[PDB]
Each structure stands twice: as C-alpha cells, then as structure tokens.
C-alpha cells in the first residue's frame, strides 16, 4: 500500500536505476530506431519464497543436469527406448560419415522451472534444455531490489528487508563461466604451436528484442574470461561461415576466426526456422567440430513427452540407481495415477477417496475436480474407473502484495510466480565432465521478479 | 574509413554495449514516458591527444583547484579588496546575517578545466567551471566503450587496432563520488555522537533533467563504494520537504528525519534554472544551512568570466601564488592578450604583431586577423596603435578521421575536441583540506562524448 507519491517516487527510482544498469529491452519495431530501449517489465518488490523450497531447488539442479545428460547419451544409441520431426531428421543427417573425427563434447545450459505448491513443496512445471533466457537480466532485477532496500528507497527511514534473505543471483556470470569452460575444453582437445583464440558464436534470432539480456553474457565472457564472441543469425551462418573439410573446424570467412562453441539463443520453435536454408544452417553447425550448446540430441531430450515419461518411477529408475536421488526428483514431479488394480492403480483409488481435494479426475467427458471426485466415482462401478486417471493439482502461492511495473504503469494485482534454476553440464559420449548449479530466476504473471526467503 | 557494412556492424555494437551499460540520456519530452531512454551521442573511435599535453593537464589541475579555492577565501574576507550575478551576490549578502548557530566553514569545490590543444603542442584553457560540472559519469562509459570495441575485436575482427596502454580510461565517476563521500565524512567528523549517524548527500537537480543517467552513476557509487545514501531534489522539493533546526542550522528532510550533510548542485548555474522567486529562496535556504555546499555561492561566483580574465594577468595571479614555477605553468595555459603602446608589454606586443602576425588577431579595445596585421598597422601610426589589442588565437588540431553517432545517424565530419579535467577541493576559510585531480573528459563537436588515445 505505498503512498500514491511514495509509489510515484519509487517508480522513477526503478526507471533511473534500470536504465543506468541496462535492465532493458527493445520495444516492437525497434529496427526503426535501435538507439532507443525501454525498461524491462519488473516487480517493484521481491516475492516471498520459502527458504526450504529454494534450497532444495538449488540442491537438486545437478541431479537434473545429470539426468538429462544421461538421457541424451542414451538416445545416441538406437538400442534404447528414449517440429521434433525435422529436428530428428537433422539428427539422422549428422550420422552421415565424415573424414574427420566428430566432436564428442556437448554443453547443456539448462533451466528447471518450479511452482511452489501449497495444497510447501516445489513442483516442476518445466525443464528447458535449449536456449534458456533471462540469466543476464535476472542478476539485474535482483540487484535492483537489493539496492532499493539498502538505499532506503523502499522506506526513507531504513531497509524493510533483511539482506540475508534477499537472493542475489549470479546467473549471468555463471552462464558465461559455463561457456568459457566449454571453450577451454575445446582448446584443450588439441594444442597449438601458434596462438589460438577460438570464440563463442551466439546464434540469434533476427530482430531480437531481448539482446541486452544476452549482451551480459558476451561482456562477462570478454571481461572475466578473456573470450571473444560474435552474434550470428541463420542468415549470417549461411553467408559467413565455412568448415575445414579435413578437421571439421568452424571458421568465419576471410577473418579466419575459429569458433569453439555454438551457443543457441534461437532454434527452439518452428518459426525460428524461416526458410529451408535455416534448417541447412543448423545442420551445418551441428556437423562442425564446434561444441554445440546444445547439440540436436540434447535439445530433443527436453521434449515434453520425455519429461512426461520421466515421471514414471520405472523409467526414471533406468537412468538413476540411487534410491535417495531418485526419491528427490519424483518428489518434485506432478503425480498421475491410473485407477485400475495394478499396484499404482490401487494407490490411485485410495488417494482419490482419502484426499480428493489434491486432484482432478480426467478422462483418458468433463474433468471432475477435487471434492466432487468421491461422489462421482460412487456412481460408477469400480471396474470402469480406469476410464479416467487421477492427476495431482498444483495450487501455487499467490502474492497479493506486489506491484508490477510495465511501461511506466503500475499494477497491484495478484501474481503467481515461477522459480527458475539454471544448470550447466559438460559431457561426452559416456561421462559427465562438469556439472554445476548456475543461478536462479523468478518470473511472475509476465515480468521479472526477485526472491525474498522466509 | 570502415566499409559501409563494417560501420553498420560497429554502430550496432555501440548501441548494444551502450544500452546494456547505461551510456544513455532521455530524449526531448521524455516526461511522457520516462521508461524509455536513448544512447548518448558519441564518437565511434577515440581522438588522438598528445601524451605530453594530457599529462600537463592532469598535473596542473591541483594548482587550479588551489587558485580558485584561494580566490574564494579572499573573496570571503570583508576588508579584502577582492543581472544573474547580482542576484547571486544578493543571496550571498543574505547569508551574512547572524544566526543562533556557528556557520559551516567547510566548502567543496567540484571543478572542471577545459582545454583546446593549440598547434601553433600546448594546452590552452578555454574555460574553468566551478559549479555543476557535467559528464563525470558518462565519461567513464564512453572510455570503456572504446576500450571494449578495441579489445573484443570489433574495430577489427583480426585484433585490436590500438595499444591499450595509450587508451585513457577515466575514473571520474568514481572519483567525483569519492570527493562527495569525503565531504560527508568531514561533515560527520566535525562533531561526534555516541549513536550511529548516517547523513546523506542531496542532489539539487533541474526539473525534467534529461541527463539523469550521468548523475545516477554518482548516486550509485556513493552507496556501493562509500555506503552513503542520497536524494534527488528540485528547488520545489527543497521548499516543500526540507527544514532547518534553528539551534544547529542542520538540514533535515521532513518526516524521515534524514540528515543532509552535503548539498551538491547539478542545477542553479544559469538564470533559467531559477523559474521563480521561490527557487531563489530555495537556494538561499540551502546556503544558510549547516550542510556543506558543493559549491557555495562564493565558490560559484569565483568562476565568473570577469574573475577568470582578472587571473590571466600575471600581476593579479601572483597575489595568490608565490612560487614562480607554479605561476609559469598556469600562465602558459592562458590565452595571451597584449597592449599596443609604449609600456613594458606594449613593445613586446608590437614586436609580436609584426614578427608572428599569423598567431594573433587585432581587436579594438572590426578585427584584423593574422597575416593582415602588419599591413593594417603600417598605414596607421604607432602612437595611435594603442587603439587596439593583440590577442593570441587558438588554432586547435582538427580530427578528420572519426565518426560521430547521434540518434542512429553517423557523421564523418572533421571535429574539434575539448579536453576536460575534473578536480575536487575541500577547504575552509584559510586552508585547503583536500585537493585532488578527479578524472578526465573529452567532448567533441563539428556535440558528443569522445575518448582519448595518447601519442
């Protein structure tokens, strides 16, 4: 409930800090004047997240990184079970033999997204294996809120928050560290008796409006890890790059700059491929000796279908033996149960009648929600119950005490928040070489938000 | 000259880096939507400046800071012989009225010396600013922009085109913030309290300020590097939110009880900054408080053009500076003017007018320029020559190898550059407590921010 003028002053303080710190994005049709940018949509205050849930999300990221790395490794062998059609087509095309040894190292830059269910437990709503965004702006919104607290902007008399509870993410720096690590492992594969300064190629979308989020990684790579980079669209890839047919190494025509890492910030949706040449550009990159982040299989490993398959204890067990790690993951999954007499089905029926409010009954015509479940099933013979499945419902913690700033307008409405956990993993055909937690993100609905632990 | 495509790519690199780093400013009428900002006008490449000239400029700043501090102290003594200006002096006289409390004797000068590189190389001061000097913050950013473009292979995909050792990277944003923090601590150090005290810096700003991002760098450095908070107030805010404790004169913000240790002006140096009698009253209210002003009325007045000219005279200068060496160094930077009569400097003037005419301009105290002087003086009479004055002209080194970026339009025109040197000085009635060089600036025009490459 900020005073109307307390709020107005607070809003301009946000605009001034954000612009001064590049917490920005290009508005539509920025191509008409690329020297103008706007403040990114953000909340004014941090959103409360339970400390216990946050620590578990952070702690479990390495286990998810490893899981998807193992799934990717398994998929590289048609002797297992694990838009997607074209991607798969490109994959098969990379199987074609070449005269140079192919690049075995892959870089996975991921992000796990959770909802804080309070039917507190984190529930995974998504695991992203390709082109994850906002690692750069996340750091800035966190620092914006921290500053507003420490500079007495939230309250002229003093901080209204305990700095020890305000999360400040280093995702921008950590993602750049992951890219620098991939470049060094590329260089380390073969030394030179000449200077070698391979770079990171950012493959971007034409007319990218969120470039400033990406620029943070480019600048950290340079200033912190001495690594240079270039921004290329599928057009630029087709026009400016070439492959040494003897080594498969990727270079930029005329300049001779060598590309060690192909970092995708586009290519995760059917419209990212505007023409057939764009598909050929992707294939061309995947075939090169450069380390892809991510390569085709890694991207495919994140298919919603596979995510669904992994919610099955039996399937999960095939990739994770440890009982402890297995239970930590399943705990975060949205549970689904059949209503037959199989082992799981008996559990389903027991839950449907003992804790109905936690679920929704969906047909395999209408769904039946929560407290209406028992009565509904009572009117159907138990033998026909398997005509439906029981699905766990997520009831997120709504924040009613926050203000969303967008285009200089403030909105004081209820918001739901999604917790994002970045993760980075470097792996080859059979082993994981590097596995790390890479920062956090919080988005409400959309806009960037920050975390306050309680 | 970069190829058309090499330039468009470089322009895109500039916009991206600049926005990501806040090297920005509000466009006209930003009031409509303050959530949008544009890239500040800047050059694409750094401008060449003689290392010798740059070092002399840096080295003499402390001498200039001290000269103007002494002038101010001299002006502060009553028995001392030493329209907008009249109004300022008017306010000053008002501060002379007694009070229940002991007046604040410490003042902070945040100055900036501006020089042209005369190639007749010698630095020639064209201006000395004693109030609300700008660009200390964006200055650091344009320097880092150019360094980035060089080190990240944007100027040339094959490698840097400049020796990083010759690229000046100013810390003026940080140094100006340190000067302010320094003023805050000396304010706090005047009298202790057994209980935590955290006075702030008050930025007095212009209404609808478009160059706020340059100023924000100072605000952020103060907090992050010196743990000092601050507030942005227009003269309207000063009148509505501040109040003075009659027993101590101390300045406070109503209701919050936050104490203001330093009043830092980023407005109030030109007549249009005062939109009404109320604004003038706000200035006086601030000047009478116990807070340390940056700068106070008298320091501001020491920067008037008359005084600056009064100083170009070796006689008046010698009053505030003994050391022949310090004096000679200062005089070298001033634009010389000569009398054309039968005195000491007179014969020297005539000699110069006929020996090196191309270096001066003759003016009646129509101007007769350069190579035309001996002729003009020949047809007249020496005894009558006294009806003129010989002034040396500054023929600055033009840079024709740069590109200026403004509102996404690039200009490849020759440019003249002005080298700015920031300086901070803390002083009381008779002594100088702190005197530092505080960073550099390079502004160019056919205006925009530029950076320095030494040679």
Curated annotation (Swiss-Prot), chain A:
Q: Which organism is it from?
A: Saccharomyces cerevisiae (strain ATCC 204508 / S288c) (Baker's yeast)
Q: Which cofactor does it need?
A: Mg(2+)
Any Pfam family the entry gives: GSH_synthase
Q: In which pathway does it act?
A: Sulfur metabolism; glutathione biosynthesis; glutathione from L-cysteine and L-glutamate: step 2/2
UniProt GO molecular function? ATP binding; glutathione binding; glutathione synthase activity; magnesium ion binding; protein homodimerization activity
Q: What else is known?
A: Present with 3430 molecules/cell in log phase SD medium.
Relate the assembly described in the record.
Homodimer.
Q: What's in the GO CC field? A: cytoplasm; cytosol
Task: Please list the residues that bind Mg(2+).
Answer: 126, 128
List ligand-binding residues for ATP: 126, 304, 362-367, 369, 391-394, 418, 445
> What chemistry does it catalyse, as a reaction equation?
gamma-L-glutamyl-L-cysteine + glycine + ATP = glutathione + ADP + phosphate + H(+)
Task: Tell me a GO biological process for this protein.
Answer: glutathione biosynthetic process
Task: Report the PANTHER family cross-referenced here.
Answer: GLUTATHIONE SYNTHETASE (PTHR11130:SF0)
The residues the record assigns to binding substrate are 111, 130-133, 208-210, 214, 265-268, 443
The UniProt keyword set, sorted, is: ATP-binding, Glutathione biosynthesis, Ligase, Magnesium, Metal-binding, Nucleotide-binding
Family label = Belongs to the eukaryotic GSH synthase family.
Q: What is this protein called?
A: Glutathione synthetase GSH2
Q: Give the EC number(s) listed in the UniProt record.
A: 6.3.2.3
Give the co-factor note. Binds 1 Mg(2+) ion per subunit.
Check the record and name the InterPro entries matching this protein.
Glutathione_synthase (IPR005615), Glutathione_synthase_a-hlx (IPR014042), Glutathione_synthase_C_euk (IPR014709), Glutathione_synthase_N_euk (IPR014049), GSH-S_sub-bd_sf (IPR037013), GSH_synth_subst-bd (IPR004887), PreATP-grasp_dom_sf (IPR016185)
UniProtKB/Swiss-Prot annotation, chain B:
Listed A to Z, the keywords are: ATP-binding, Glutathione biosynthesis, Ligase, Magnesium, Metal-binding, Nucleotide-binding
Pfam families registered for this protein in UniProt:
GSH_synth_ATP (PF03917), GSH_synthase (PF03199)
Q: Which GO terms describe its molecular function?
A: ATP binding; glutathione binding; glutathione synthase activity; magnesium ion binding; protein homodimerization activity
Task: Tell me the route in metabolism or biology where this protein functions.
Answer: Sulfur metabolism; glutathione biosynthesis; glutathione from L-cysteine and L-glutamate: step 2/2
Which cofactors are required for activity?
A: Mg(2+)
Q: Look up the EC number in the record and give it.
A: 6.3.2.3
To which protein family does this belong? Belongs to the eukaryotic GSH synthase family.
Query: Partners and quaternary state?
Result: Homodimer.
Q: What is this protein called?
A: Glutathione synthetase GSH2
Q: What is the lineage of its organism?
A: Eukaryota, Fungi, Dikarya, Ascomycota, Saccharomycotina
Report the gene name: GSH2
């Amino acid at each position: 409930p900020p005073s109307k003028d307390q709020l107005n002053e607070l809003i301009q303080e946000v605009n001034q800090w954000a612009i001064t710190n590049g917490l920005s994005m290009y508005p539509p049709k920025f191509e008409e004047n690329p020297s103008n940018a706007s403040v990114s949509p953000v909340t004014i205050y941090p959103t409360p997240i339970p400390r216990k849930c946050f620590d578990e999300a952070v702690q479990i990221q390495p286990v998810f990184n490893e899981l998807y790395a193992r799934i990717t490794q398994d998929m590289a062998q048609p002797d297992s079970y694990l838009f997607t059609g074209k991607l798969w087509s490109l994959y098969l095309a990379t199987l074609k033999s070449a005269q140079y040894k192919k690049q075995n190292f892959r870089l996975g830059i991921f992000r796990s997204d959770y909802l804080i269910d309070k039917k507190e437990q984190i529930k995974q709503v998504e695991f992203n294996t390709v082109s994850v965004s906002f690692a750069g702006l996340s750091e800035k919104v966190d620092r914006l809120h921290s500053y507003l607290n420490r500079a007495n902007k939230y309250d002229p008399k003093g901080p209204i928050y305990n700095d020890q509870n305000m999360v400040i993410s280093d995702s921008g720096y950590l993602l750049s560290k992951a890219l620098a690590k991939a470049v060094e492992s590329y260089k380390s594969q073969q030394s030179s008796s000449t200077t070698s300064d391979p770079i990171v190629a950012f493959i971007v979308q034409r007319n990218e409006r969120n470039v400033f989020d990406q620029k943070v990684l480019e600048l950290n790579l340079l200033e912190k890890f001495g690594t240079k980079s270039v921004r290329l669209t599928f057009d630029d890839v087709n026009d400016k790059l070439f492959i040494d047919d003897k080594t498969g190494k990727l270079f930029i025509r005329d300049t001779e700059q060598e590309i060690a890492v192909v970092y995708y910030r586009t290519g995760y949706t059917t419209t990212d491929y505007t023409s057939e040449k764009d598909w050929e550009a992707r294939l061309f990159l995947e075939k090169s000796f450069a380390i892809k982040a991510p390569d085709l299989l890694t991207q495919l490993s994140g298919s919603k279908k596979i995510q669904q398959l992994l919610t099955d204890e039996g399937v999960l067990g095939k990739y994770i033996s440890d009982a402890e790690k297995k239970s930590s993951l399943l705990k975060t999954f949205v549970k689904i149960y059949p209503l037959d007499d199989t082992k799981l089905g008996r559990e389903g029926k027991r839950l449907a009648l003992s804790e109905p409010s936690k679920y929704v009954l969906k047909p395999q015509g209408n769904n039946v929600y929560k407290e209406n479940i028992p009565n509904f099933l009572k009117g159907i013979e138990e033998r026909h119950w398997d005509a439906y499945i029981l699905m766990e419902l997520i009831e997120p913690e709504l924040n009613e005490n926050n203000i969303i700033l967008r285009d200089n307008k403030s909105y004081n409405e209820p918001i739901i928040s999604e917790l994002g956990i970045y993760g980075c993993v470097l792996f080859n055909d059979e082993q994981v070489l590097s596995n790390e937690f890479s920062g956090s993100l919080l988005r409400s609905k959309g806009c960037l938000d920050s975390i306050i632990l309680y």
